[PDB]
Write a protein that binds this ligand. Structure first.
Ligand SMILES: [Ca+2]
Ligand SMILES: [Ca+2]
Ligand SMILES: [Ca+2]
Ligand SMILES: [Ca+2]
Length: 148
């Protein structure tokens, strides 16, 4: 739950404003409706309905300021922890071809401080290669390097 300042909470009302088109202080499936549709995204009832269920802590069918601010924040950390392990893959992927070779891990690992034989890097790879392509994708990465 929030600690945040008022500079923090105010960017939050502004936010909570673009959604609350009638200015009543809550957000409806129809107001969510309409926003998803500005931003070129034409959804269906279920999705909307599911998107609200989601944020609707207390189930009156609506979302007030506080339930939004929770989510908004929770999903704030997360957009960060995302990118966090995205910058990471970014150095590890020296060629940023998309996937990380074994030779690249070794380059890094030794670009930093440890000296592995190929064997020991390949052994690194395999453990983290789920699509068994021999390389390491954001996906396998992060399945790994977060967890491990
Ligand atoms: Ca409203
Ligand atoms: Ca609610
Ligand atoms: Ca690469
Ligand atoms: Ca792979």
């Amino acid at each position: 739950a929030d600690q945040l300042t008022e500079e923090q909470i105010a960017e939050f009302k502004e936010a909570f404003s673009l959604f609350d088109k009638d200015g009543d202080g809550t957000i409806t499936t129809k107001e969510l409706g309409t926003v998803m549709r500005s931003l070129g995204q034409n959804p269906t009832e279920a999705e909307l309905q599911d998107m609200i269920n989601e944020v609707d802590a207390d189930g009156n069918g609506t979302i007030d300021f506080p339930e939004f601010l929770t989510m908004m924040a929770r999903k704030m950390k997360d957009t960060d922890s995302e990118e966090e392990i995205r910058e990471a893959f970014r150095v590890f992927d020296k060629d940023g071809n998309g996937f990380i070779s074994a030779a690249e891990l070794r380059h890094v690992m030794t670009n930093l401080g440890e000296k592995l034989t190929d064997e020991e890097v390949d052994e690194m790879i395999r453990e983290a290669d789920i699509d068994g392509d021999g390389q390491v994708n954001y996906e396998e990465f992060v399945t790994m390097m977060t967890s491990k």
